[PDB]
Design a protein around this nucleic acid. Sequence first.
RNA 1: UAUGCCAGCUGGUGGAUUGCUCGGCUCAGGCGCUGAUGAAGGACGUGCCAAGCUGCGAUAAGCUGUGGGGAGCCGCACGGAGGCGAAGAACCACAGAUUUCCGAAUGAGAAUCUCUAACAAUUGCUUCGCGCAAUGAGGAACCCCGAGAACUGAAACAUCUCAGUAUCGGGAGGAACAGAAAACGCAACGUGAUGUCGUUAGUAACCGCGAGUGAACGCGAUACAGCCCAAACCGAAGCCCUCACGGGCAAUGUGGUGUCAGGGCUACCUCUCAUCAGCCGACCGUCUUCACGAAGUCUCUUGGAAUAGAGCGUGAUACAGGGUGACAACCCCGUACUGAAGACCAGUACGCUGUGCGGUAGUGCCAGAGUAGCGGGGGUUGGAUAUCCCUCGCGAAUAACGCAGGCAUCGACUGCGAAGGCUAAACACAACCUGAGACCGAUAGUGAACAAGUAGUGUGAACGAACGCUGCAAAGUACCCUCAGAAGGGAGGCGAAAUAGAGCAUGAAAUCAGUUGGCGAUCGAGCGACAGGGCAUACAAGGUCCCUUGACGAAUGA
RNA 2: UGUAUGGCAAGUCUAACCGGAGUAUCCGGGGAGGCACAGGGAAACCGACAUGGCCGCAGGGCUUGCCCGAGGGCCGCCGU
Lengths: 145, 115, 246, 119
Amino acid sequence: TSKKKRQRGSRTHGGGSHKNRRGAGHRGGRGDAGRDKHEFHNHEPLGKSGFKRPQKVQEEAATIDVREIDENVTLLAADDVAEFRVDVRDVVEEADDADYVKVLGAGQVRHELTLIADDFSEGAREKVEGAGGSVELTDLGEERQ
Amino acid sequence: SKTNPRLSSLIADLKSAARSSGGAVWGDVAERLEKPRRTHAEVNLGRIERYAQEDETVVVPGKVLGSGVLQKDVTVAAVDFSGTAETKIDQVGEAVSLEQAIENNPEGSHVRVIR
Amino acid sequence: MQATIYDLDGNTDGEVDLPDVFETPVRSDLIGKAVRAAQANRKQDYGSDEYAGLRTPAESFGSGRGQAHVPKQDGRARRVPQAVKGRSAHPPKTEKDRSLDLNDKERQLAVRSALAATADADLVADRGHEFDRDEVPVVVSDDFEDLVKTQEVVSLLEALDVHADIDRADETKIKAGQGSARGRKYRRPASILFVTSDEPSTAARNLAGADVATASEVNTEDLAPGGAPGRLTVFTESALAEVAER
Amino acid sequence: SKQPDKQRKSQRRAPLHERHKQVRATLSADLREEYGQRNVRVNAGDTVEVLRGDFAGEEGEVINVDLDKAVIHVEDVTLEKTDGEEVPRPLDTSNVRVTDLDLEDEKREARLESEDDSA
RNA sequence: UAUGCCAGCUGGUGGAUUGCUCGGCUCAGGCGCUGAUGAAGGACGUGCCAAGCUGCGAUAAGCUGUGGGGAGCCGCACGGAGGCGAAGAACCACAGAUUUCCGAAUGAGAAUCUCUAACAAUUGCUUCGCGCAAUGAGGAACCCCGAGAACUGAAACAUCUCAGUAUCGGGAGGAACAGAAAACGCAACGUGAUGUCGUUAGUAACCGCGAGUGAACGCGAUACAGCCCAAACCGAAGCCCUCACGGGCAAUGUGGUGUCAGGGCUACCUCUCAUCAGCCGACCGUCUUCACGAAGUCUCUUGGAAUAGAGCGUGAUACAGGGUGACAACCCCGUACUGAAGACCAGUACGCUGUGCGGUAGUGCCAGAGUAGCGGGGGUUGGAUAUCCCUCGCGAAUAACGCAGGCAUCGACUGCGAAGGCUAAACACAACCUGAGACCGAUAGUGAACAAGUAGUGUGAACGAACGCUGCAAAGUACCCUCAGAAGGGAGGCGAAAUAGAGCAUGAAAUCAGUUGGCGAUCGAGCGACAGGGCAUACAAGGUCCCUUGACGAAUGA
RNA sequence: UGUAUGGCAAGUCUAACCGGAGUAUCCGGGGAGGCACAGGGAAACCGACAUGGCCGCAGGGCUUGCCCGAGGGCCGCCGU
Ligand SMILES: [Cl-]
Ligand SMILES: [Cl-]
Ligand SMILES: [Cl-]
Ligand SMILES: [Mg+2]
Ligand SMILES: [Mg+2]
Ligand SMILES: [Mg+2]
Ligand SMILES: [Mg+2]
Ligand SMILES: [Mg+2]
Ligand SMILES: [Mg+2]
Ligand SMILES: [Mg+2]
Ligand SMILES: [Mg+2]
Ligand SMILES: [Mg+2]
Ligand SMILES: [Mg+2]
Ligand SMILES: [Mg+2]
Ligand SMILES: [Mg+2]
Ligand SMILES: [Mg+2]
Ligand code: NA
Ligand code: NA
Ligand code: NA
Ligand code: NA
Ligand code: NA
Ligand code: NA
Ligand code: NA
Ligand code: NA
Ligand code: NA
Ligand code: NA
Ligand code: NA
Ligand code: NA
Ligand code: NA
Ligand code: NA
Ligand code: NA
Ligand code: NA
Ligand code: NA
Ligand code: NA
Ligand code: NA
Ligand code: NA
Ligand SMILES: [Sr+2]
Ligand SMILES: [Sr+2]
Ligand SMILES: [Sr+2]
Ligand SMILES: [Sr+2]
Ligand SMILES: [Sr+2]
Ligand SMILES: [Sr+2]
Ligand SMILES: [Sr+2]
Ligand SMILES: [Sr+2]
Ligand SMILES: [Sr+2]
Ligand SMILES: [Sr+2]
Ligand SMILES: [Sr+2]
Ligand SMILES: [Sr+2]
Ligand SMILES: [Sr+2]
Ligand SMILES: [Sr+2]
């Protein structure tokens, strides 16, 4: 039995005095009315902030942490097995509609990896080089100058 | 109120074991299972690897999921395991149902609760 | 497990391995959900005329004549919900979504579980079916699909001690209530489901309470009518095999 | 259709030629064997036996066939009025069986004896 | 005990309730234009007796033909009289005949009539003659082009919002509109006509930057289809009317060529299966209608009536639904199976006839102007500098040129050729047909199950109800008595039932007549709850209750 | 935007629509796209603890106060 089902006989259906559930006055105006007067509370403040760059001049990178690559190396037997070698462009999903692929450095690298991607972070390099291995930048990744 | 008949049976079996045999774990797991689904455990493998030890059964009062690596030879007991979780555990250890754990260990000894 | 195959005379003609899906744990709540969805999804949209009771220029006289402020036309009250011939306040609306959604996995698990409930002799007898067997489902040879006559299927089911179920369903109930005026006067118990492989059994379809189906499309409803698991079913050797990868 | 309202509608509002099917009665064992039919459109002149009413068991000749009301008048199947007059009690052909036919018409005989069509 | 209070009983009144459904409501599929060859609509007629409805039109509930159908019939509507039908009627399908007057209403006028040969009016062609043609008006909504509010929201209000909504003017179709890039701009070594659906996304954008408002490219689908002029170069090689003769058109250009895979011209290579015109012309499917179509009407009991119970038996590619004196697969119509026809798809697809695709080199021959574009003023849009449009003024180039790529200029790059035109299919609606339903079930559901847009109200625009049910069968009450009496009443007859007797299934409450129980003409008013007494009570569905005594015996307690 | 229940889970769900069929149900296909899987910054742009310390509930362990202590709590540290 729901709350709605127990209302017959209550007269007011939980609204208090029968003088309550009338029009928009009970809401203090229609919709977001008085967002700066009587109902200013918990509203985002009035005003403009910043600018937006045109959508076609906006680049969207496909990100992946070293932790995701490293945890799934034995499962990724469909890729190259070196002295492991993996092209990141084939691992990340939605890499078609993305502008470039970037490897970020969150987590640990327990294996020796040779990663090929368009961009790498300072911490993505340190973790792959420090755990014995190389980082190969693509021909598309030759933008850093 | 639960709607699954199998979960209702598991809870009743966990209770029967905690009252009959010398255990407090199965009654503790039963109390968490009687609680809402949102409170139940959603444990990944990287957590069982960090806090579990060998020859000590891991009891999850919820469901085990497949994120992360498990190297330890542990017997994991849960209400359910994901397809990948059960596959990844059986490679290095053993994924056991909580219904089996009650028959194999009714006293609930040498057991670690992980959430 | 093992399932005994029967020829058109009702004699044992070998046996094949009963597939893995028949060992799926019976889950009546999930089966009931899949049937509740199927029954709701075939329901038609309805609703009263959006303008019923609003086709009048009726006005209230207001204060002054010792009468309630009710809209009147030619000294007769109109429009308002409390008035005879007035609009229906909160009527059935056509815009209402009367369909229920179900996840493919949750629905597929229900089909598997309903199929599994068919393999338990006690559940089948608990559902209501009348039979004299231990082994269930009844597994018959592929030469069943070639039968043309209905009376020939009667003889086979009598030889299989499974005809007593059609005698249960050979009693129509004249329902209580106004469903009668809408074409829903009768109803009868659900008996045997016949699952074939190529075409549904034209020979078995007219049997009292019987339902015919094919293994590529046999659903939760024909497998568990009204959400009640454990229907007395007969499979074709090839149907048993095709219903394995569902 | 399957809807009861539409079923009764089509029967009560059926055109005159379609009302012929509403005055059909079953044939006896001998007549079913002779013509290859189960039933026939009852005609004025046929001999019939009452199988269901208060007149169950009685035989008589068909005096009138009213297509409009879809009923028949059979001989001696009467009701006595208050003045003393014996008026016919209309019978539904469904409660009646044909024992002998009136084959004066060449077309009715031809229709009854052909295997392609029914009368 | 008068007037009278409470409850009940018998009978009314009333029409709730229950059961029933010839009507609604909603969803789905199919289909879809009519009209000067006078529509739609309306008026008045039309029947043996005919007021309403339906049909029909002076040939008037109908005439003819073909096919179907069949022994009956003469609508709704069961009367009386009479008639028609084996010379094959009724009835149904198709086609045809007739088809008054008003009505776009068209000779002129007029409240449905009248006055003295009529396309009135406006047009095109033209034999310049109304000779040949066109337009007009209707249609449920859908569609396209114009005109365009306010309440309201913003808690006031002006921009904004309601909303390009309501409403108005004009117009087409069965669908409309759109449409083969002066496109896009995931900027690309990329896409490739157009609608529509899903998404992109409440994103970009707008906005007293308040409230609010709000795309697109792309993508996944549906369906797919591309073409014709103007000009260059030719220059009467042409077109329309007519049987012909003959006439009209046309150098202010008919016709050929050609249309960004630019084309033309000149010189060559090869070739066509492209395109355009034209002939033929479906399968399948879908929608509807139709033919055929299995098996009990056996026994006993109950009943007014078996379609009930018990017993025996049967069919099923048919156990959908309905009918029939009560619960019916087998009594009747149907239902499955098979087959037929019409309509739509569609004058489409396929096939065919004809034409002829294309490539090289040269050639500044051709390629749509108040346009592109700028400025003033407005509207509109998400369009922001960067939407679309209107108005006023100004205003270019000529492919060696021009436009676009979300501010302007110049260069580069990429895309694309405006100011001419056509175009199937996929999508909207629901008049019309058919189907369906966890919709409503006669104060509901349409306003309308009934005479329903009826009766009735208003000068008019307009407004607008209520009314469903005898019975299995009319067997719808003969005869007699009474009475002023075809009234009514009494007696009587029918039926299972008249307390089923005509607004006639059931028959609630309020309430009325009569009557039973209780109270009652010296007595006080929320009408009762709980206790306890009087009086009253057929059975049934409740069976307990009283007194001596005795046992037990809390708190309390002589 | 919560909550209860249920499926699946580092993922999850299909939309329009297509095929089948018992033809509005239903079986199969469809991941376009949405949300989640990293954040911070107006923007350019840059890009994180699969655990380093201490308390300690439940639970487990032991030779019965002592250990291990998920979750939780207090810190460190890391991205911008
Ligand atoms: Cl930005
Ligand atoms: Cl986790
Ligand atoms: Cl593109
Ligand atoms: Mg109403
Ligand atoms: Mg009821
Ligand atoms: Mg015959
Ligand atoms: Mg005139
Ligand atoms: Mg105002
Ligand atoms: Mg306001
Ligand atoms: Mg304000
Ligand atoms: Mg707007
Ligand atoms: Mg665009
Ligand atoms: Mg040409
Ligand atoms: Mg505006
Ligand atoms: Mg009404
Ligand atoms: Mg009555
Ligand atoms: Na109120
Ligand atoms: Na893309
Ligand atoms: Na009205
Ligand atoms: Na009053
Ligand atoms: Na809906
Ligand atoms: Na008085
Ligand atoms: Na149509
Ligand atoms: Na009349
Ligand atoms: Na006519
Ligand atoms: Na004319
Ligand atoms: Na003229
Ligand atoms: Na206000
Ligand atoms: Na005001
Ligand atoms: Na504004
Ligand atoms: Na009958
Ligand atoms: Na301007
Ligand atoms: Na462009
Ligand atoms: Na009524
Ligand atoms: Na008393
Ligand atoms: Na996807
Ligand atoms: Sr409340
Ligand atoms: Sr209001
Ligand atoms: Sr303020
Ligand atoms: Sr993608
Ligand atoms: Sr008639
Ligand atoms: Sr009649
Ligand atoms: Sr195309
Ligand atoms: Sr041009
Ligand atoms: Sr009434
Ligand atoms: Sr007036
Ligand atoms: Sr009497
Ligand atoms: Sr007083
Ligand atoms: Sr005592
Ligand atoms: Sr899925």
